[PDB]
Amino acid sequence: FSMKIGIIGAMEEEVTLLRDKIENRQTISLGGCEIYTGQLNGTEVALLKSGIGKVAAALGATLLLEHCKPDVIINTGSAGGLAPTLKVGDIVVSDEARYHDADVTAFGYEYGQLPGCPAGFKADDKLIAAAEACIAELNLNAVRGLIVSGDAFINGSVGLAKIRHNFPQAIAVEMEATAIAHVCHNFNVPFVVVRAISDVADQQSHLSFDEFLAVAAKQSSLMVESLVQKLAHG
Amino acid sequence: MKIGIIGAMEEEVTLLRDKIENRQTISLGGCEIYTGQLNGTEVALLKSGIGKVAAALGATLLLEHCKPDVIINTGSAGGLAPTLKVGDIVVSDEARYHDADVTAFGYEYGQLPGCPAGFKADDKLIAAAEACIAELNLNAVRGLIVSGDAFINGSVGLAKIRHNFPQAIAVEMEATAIAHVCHNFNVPFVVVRAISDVADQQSHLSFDEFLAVAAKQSSLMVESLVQKLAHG
Ligand SMILES: CSC[C@H]1CN(Cc2c[nH]c3c(N)ncnc23)C[C@@H]1O
Numbered sequence: 001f002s003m004k005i006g007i008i009g010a011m012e013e014e015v016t017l018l019r020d021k022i023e024n025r026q027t028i029s030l031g032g033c034e035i036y037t038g039q040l041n042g043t044e045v046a047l048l049k050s051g052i053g054k055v056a057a058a059l060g061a062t063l064l065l066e067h068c069k070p071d072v073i074i075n076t077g078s079a080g081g082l083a084p085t086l087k088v089g090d091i092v093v094s095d096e097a098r099y100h101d102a103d104v105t106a107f108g109y110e111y112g113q114l115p116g117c118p119a120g121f122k123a124d125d126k127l128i129a130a131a132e133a134c135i136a137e138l139n140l141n142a143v144r145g146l147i148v149s150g151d152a153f154i155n156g157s158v159g160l161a162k163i164r165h166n167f168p169q170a171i172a173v174e175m176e177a178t179a180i181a182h183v184c185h186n187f188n189v190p191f192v193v194v195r196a197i198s199d200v201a202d203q204q205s206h207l208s209f210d211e212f213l214a215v216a217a218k219q220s221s222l223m224v225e226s227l228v229q230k231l232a233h234g
Numbered sequence: 235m236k237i238g239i240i241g242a243m244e245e246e247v248t249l250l251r252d253k254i255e256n257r258q259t260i261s262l263g264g265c266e267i268y269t270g271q272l273n274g275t276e277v278a279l280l281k282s283g284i285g286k287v288a289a290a291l292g293a294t295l296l297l298e299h300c301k302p303d304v305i306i307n308t309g310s311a312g313g314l315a316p317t318l319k320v321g322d323i324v325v326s327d328e329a330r331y332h333d334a335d336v337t338a339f340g341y342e343y344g345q346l347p348g349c350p351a352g353f354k355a356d357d358k359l360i361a362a363a364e365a366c367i368a369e370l371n372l373n374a375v376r377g378l379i380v381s382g383d384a385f386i387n388g389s390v391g392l393a394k395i396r397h398n399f400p401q402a403i404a405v406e407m408e409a410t411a412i413a414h415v416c417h418n419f420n421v422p423f424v425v426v427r428a429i430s431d432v433a434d435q436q437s438h439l440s441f442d443e444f445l446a447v448a449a450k451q452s453s454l455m456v457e458s459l460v461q462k463l464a465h466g
Pocket residue numbers: 010011051052053077078079080152153154155173174175176198199200201205209336339347
């Protein structure tokens with residue numbers, strides 16, 4: 001009864017379902033971002049609409065942390081599925097997050113690692129465990145593992161081949177998760193990424209995205225709602 | 235008048251940090267900000283760390299906690315324009331991400347949805363920089379500076395930059411993130427960096443050899459620019 005859960009989403013479509021469920025909602029406009037405060041079935045939350053990309057996600061995560069001091073962070077939204085058993089609508093939960101477009105290897109850093117940061121950012125065990133409890137309880141098809149972020153919308157070709165080569169075990173790719181993990185790391189705040197598949201990052205990922213962003217938003221939102229409740233009570 | 239200054243590496247901010255009098259340090263989100271006076275002018279100096287996200291986070295804290303009137307981005311850089319040599323100054327007319335690609339949805343290459351394709355540096359800040367450049371007899375080039383989360387080392391990475399931005403005069407890893415955050419807060423910015431390498435296949439070796447030289451040239455220019463902006 002004294003916990004505040006932070007939730008971050010990039011697009012309007014990705015946060016609108018959660019925003020509409022907030023009781024006593026109030027809006028905070030700042031730094032070009034929007035923060036919606038209130039409760040989700042009695043649980044205090046702070047929902048940030050960040051905008052697309054690493055910097056927008058970083059700027060917004062920083063404002064959310066400074067301004068609302070949430071206890072944990074949940075990143076929601078869509079994603080391009082990379083694991084083989086994933087289908088549109090399926091859930092992906094992060095074990096860890098890495099930049100697939102960072103390269104300071106000329107200096108001896110691991111591919112994807114930036115100087116002064118760990119090669120990858122690890123998601124919180126408890127948060128990950130609660131997300132799986134919800135996946136079991138809702139009987140959804142989900143996959144857990146490494147999620148990679150970059151500032152490009154992956155649409156087949158070499159973009160996708162480069163990723164599969166450098167991160168063979170990556171299960172999904174998107175554009176804000178790792179930026180958020182990075183900010184949470186520097187502020188020492190627990191985070192987890194729980195997104196849903198809207199495409200498979202191949203040559204038609206853009207068309208698939210147009211057709212299924214809605215189901216990914218809906219499925220991701222349902223998961224966030226369940227996770228907020230499980231973290232609040234049990 | 236309060237002038238904000240951002241540097242990624244400690245080596246890029248150490249000379250400036252040393253000249254700040256009435257100095258105080260704030261430690262937030264893994265970053266450090268040093269407040270005080272640089273030769274009589276109020277400044278807020280931030281050491282952000284390397285790359286876009288680090289720079290974004292740090293810029294956000296600087297603007298939130300110190301509310302500077304303008305922002306100056308200092309440090310080293312990979313030279314792209316043909317007349318640049320190690321030590322030379324580069325001034326941003328504008329900043330663009332060389333590694334952002336959402337063209338599948340119709341945005342310009344380098345453009346992220348919700349942002350202009352490129353961020354324009356402030357004219358007054360640019361003029362003042364140019365006057366310091368002249369007064370000090372420095373060799374400099376003005377124009378487009380491209381940012382990415384990769385250290386450029388010739389080969390394919392350099393070729394891709396040349397393809398998308400044939401007129402980019404230099405490449406680095408924080409400037410456009412700083413520009414993007416300044417944009418969201420309506421703060422003017424300008425980038426004043428010095429060349430440590432020419433982003434070719436031997437850029438690692440050159441950076442190792444000339445980072446200090448680039449740090450000193452850029453710091454000296456920032457120092458002159460601060461004085462000119464506050465005391466004409
Ligand atoms: C309008 S640009 C898209 C928004 C969706 N977020 C996720 C995403 C789904 N499929 C992806 C893919 N194939 N490549 C990269 N990212 C994604 C990232 C961006 O905010």
